Design a protein around this ligand. Structure first.
Ligand SMILES: *[C@@H](CNC(=O)CNC(=O)[C@@H](NC(=O)[C@@H](NCC)c1cc(Cl)cc(Cl)c1)C(C)(C)C)CS(C)(=O)=O
Lengths: 11, 204
């Protein structure tokens, strides 16, 4: 399938 | 040109996203505000009042506290913003506040295109990911039986001759895909494969 990039966001 | 909200809403239901599916939204899909349940959706890049431009898929996993954003081209947030006038920050804001304790969340997304530059199979692919997400939401992007059929390629390679034999080959197996699983697909298959063709954007 597809490669991806995980980005930890905070709010 | 492309798949309409009904088309997608019907297919997403043939693929079983039923119990988990929050509908089809213009660019103003709220987020996942409801409860911490495996949810997902389809969000157009444009506001309803343009007529509608590009389809996106969005998913929520409980365990991992992870929003999946899926653009069949894997455009970066920055590119999606530039090409489609689309951003989904306050989207993730509402979400991560609605749903996460530490008010933090992971954003997982493609760097890799499955679509041909010219194709309009943008919802049909979004639907395909929403099948993989609702059966393996821990590893939706790759290494599950639904995306193992598809071949990602570096986004940045999009306007390149080398890739298209593979980008057509995703789009055949994407049709094989839907045909296999969706009664509405087979029913409308001919007009669907015609309106979402590999080269529709120069068949306009
Ligand atoms: C891929 C091809 N683009 C599309 O499939 C986008 N399709 C559409 O925008 C739909 N539009 C609709 O279904 C609109 N409803 C008409 C009553 C609509 C619905 C919703 Cl939920 C939201 C919006 Cl913003 C609009 C049509 C009928 C095909 C236009 C994208 S690409 C070409 O690969 O960049």
């Amino acid at each position: 399938g597809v490669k991806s990039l995980k980005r930890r966001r905070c709010y | 040109s492309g798949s309409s909200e009904q088309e997608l809403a019907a297919i997403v239901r043939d693929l079983g996203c039923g119990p988990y599916f929050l509908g089809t939204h213009d660019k103003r899909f709220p987020g996942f505000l409801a409860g911490n349940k495996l949810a997902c959706a389809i969000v157009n890049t444009a506001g309803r009042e343009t007529g509608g431009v590009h389809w996106l898929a969005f998913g929520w996993n409980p365990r991992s506290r992870t929003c999946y954003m899926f653009d069949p081209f894997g455009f970066s947030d920055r590119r999606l913003k530039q090409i489609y006038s689309f951003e989904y920050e306050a989207m993730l804001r509402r979400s991560a506040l609605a749903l996460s304790p530490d008010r933090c969340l992971s954003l997982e997304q493609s760097t890799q295109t499955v679509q041909g530059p010219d194709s309009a199979a943008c919802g049909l692919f979004c639907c395909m990911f929403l099948h993989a997400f609702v059966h393996w939401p821990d590893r939706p992007m790759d290494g599950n039986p639904t995306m193992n059929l598809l071949t990602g390629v570096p986004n940045g390679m999009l306007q390149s001759p080398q890739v298209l034999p593979t980008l057509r080959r995703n789009q055949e197996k994407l049709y094989r895909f839907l045909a296999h699983h969706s009664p509405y697909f087979r029913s409308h298959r001919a007009a669907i494969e015609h309106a979402t063709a590999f080269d529709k954007m120069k068949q306009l």
